[PDB]
Write a protein that binds this ligand. Structure first.
Ligand SMILES: NC(=O)[C@H]1CCC[C@H]1c1ccsc1
Ligand SMILES: NC(=O)[C@H]1CCC[C@H]1c1ccsc1
Lengths: 304, 304
């Protein structure tokens, strides 16, 4: 029992973190097989960052300009290429700690673990969600760029995020491991406002199922609703619209608890309309939206 | 920027987790050097757990009754002893993945990382605090016993917690790695009520400093208070009394922010007396007490 914001064990990703230095800029890279993946802004001075021409900046860079250190042993760079917003540095040695891995572009609402890193060294691990405005609410200081988000399925690490940038509003923007930004963000020091940070309704509902399973039931009411009626309420409160897809995904939590998805929607409707009246749910005084239905099943069943 | 409930990288502890089986009971052990540490209730049937005589149960057990598996390779047990509430199983092989490590008994209010495990396999990692009533608010299913709490100082893992028991109130009790329970808890299936779960005042104040550093300042007021005056308010709200020791520990956050500890105490006093009036601090609608002053400094400075 008990419900915790839980990250994946970070060991498999720890073994892939390296330091990448180009001139005076140091940040983190990800070493998988004989390739080190890092943000392309490694080649920039913070002066460059106001309006960088990455193609032009990269012409000036040779393999020997990319200093790659794994612990206290230097990797030899035999090749470099820009793919979108990442650099791929070919090294002469395959990372012996390379786990089974995939590159995946996640959808907004999807959760993952961040191994925050500085100078290629892990500092800590936390669970995130891709916000519907394609930002993440992270914890990243100068030097954290190239820190990666990931999921683990048994022994396979699915990398989904590489950290690139803090918006002037202190939220975080980054790419997949093909170097494509989530959302409309560019690797430039410029006016970039995030859109509306909507609540991930299916995640809140999953979290309400998790609460019921853990004995926090005070918020269960006598009411039901319809997808259309719920969705009017959700519009009002900047909640993501709930689809039949979301209802189907919540099926196993529905079955386990014996609470129909639409009944739980009516509980959420009352919580939105009435607030928690100074009460808590799984030790939160607001509605948590960074557990997926899959996250609730996994934590509540104990998958390793 | 941004502030996250952050766990230590779990890699170093992942390499120590093994499965221990005695008859029909399986749980987790911790393999350091040539010793596997596990909860002594590994020798119990859930029938035994109502009133176990561990000394008597252990007479019936030989080294070959303790099945210890690290991945898919069996460890040979050459010795067993009971120390307090843990078993120490001497194996013929030193864990090659043994990190630098210490056993430490933490004080209530101290934070640590839990690597939740099932059948010796890591499922996830989260940050905890030892509550002032010597319970932890964990996430532990059947099979999670022997999962361990730890801190890391650069390369040294300080193990502080081994998981033993869920109270009927769904909070968690356990031992240090010498097998001494935190608080008055015993490894028996019996009436055990936790005392008052007081709020860790010095941690809440550290978290308010973290909020100020991250731009969440709405709660800073024009008032100050005294230790004695604050402590009357803290008594009323089941907050731990604030000592000069706590004030000294908060010194560096005080210096960084230029907000005197007693001024911040007056901000906390108003928040206790007035509540947050539907507002949030670092994305929380209540006062977070599971960051230590050390945690705030580390996260806010980026220690690896
Ligand atoms: N907004 C930021 O993170 C800037 C401060 C440090 C990195 C730099 C940047 C800008 C666009 S990509 C990286
Ligand atoms: N309260 C509990 O956790 C019981 C259920 C499973 C383990 C068993 C126990 C009791 C005292 S120590 C371990």
């Amino acid at each position: 029992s008990g419900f915790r914001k839980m990250a994946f064990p970070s060991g498999k990703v720890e073994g892939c973190m390296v330091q990448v230095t180009c001139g005076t800029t140091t940040l983190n890279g990800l070493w998988l097989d004989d390739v080190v993946y890092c943000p392309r802004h490694v080649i920039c001075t913070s002066e460059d960052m106001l309006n960088p021409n990455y193609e032009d900046l990269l012409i000036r860079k040779s393999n020997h300009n990319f200093l790659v250190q794994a612990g206290n042993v230097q990797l030899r760079v035999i090749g470099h290429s820009m793919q979108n917003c990442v650099l791929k540095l070919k090294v002469d040695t395959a990372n012996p700690k390379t786990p089974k891995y995939k590159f995946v572009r996640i959808q907004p609402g999807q959760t993952f673990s961040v191994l925050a890193c500085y100078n290629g060294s892990p500092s800590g691990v936390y669970q995130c969600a891709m916000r519907p405005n394609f930002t993440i609410k992270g914890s990243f200081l100068n030097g954290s760029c190239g820190s990666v988000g990931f999921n683990i399925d048994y022994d396979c690490v699915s990398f989904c995020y590489m950290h690139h940038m803090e918006l002037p509003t202190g939220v975080h923007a980054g790419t997949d491991l093909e170097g494509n930004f989530y959302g409309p963000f560019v690797d430039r020091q410029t006016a970039q406002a995030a859109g509306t940070d909507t609540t991930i309704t299916v995640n809140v509902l999953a979290w309400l199922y998790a609460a019921v399973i853990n004995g926090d039931r005070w918020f269960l009411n006598r009411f039901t609703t319809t997808l259309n009626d719920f969705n009017l309420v959700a519009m009002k409160y900047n909640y993501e619209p709930l689809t039949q897809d979301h209802v189907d995904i919540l099926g196993p939590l529905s079955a386990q608890t014996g609470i129909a998805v639409l009944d739980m929607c009516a509980s959420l409707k009352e919580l939105l309309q009435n607030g928690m009246n100074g009460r808590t749910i799984l030790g939160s005084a607001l509605l948590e939206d960074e557990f997926t239905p899959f996250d609730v099943v996994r934590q509540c069943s104990g998958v390793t």
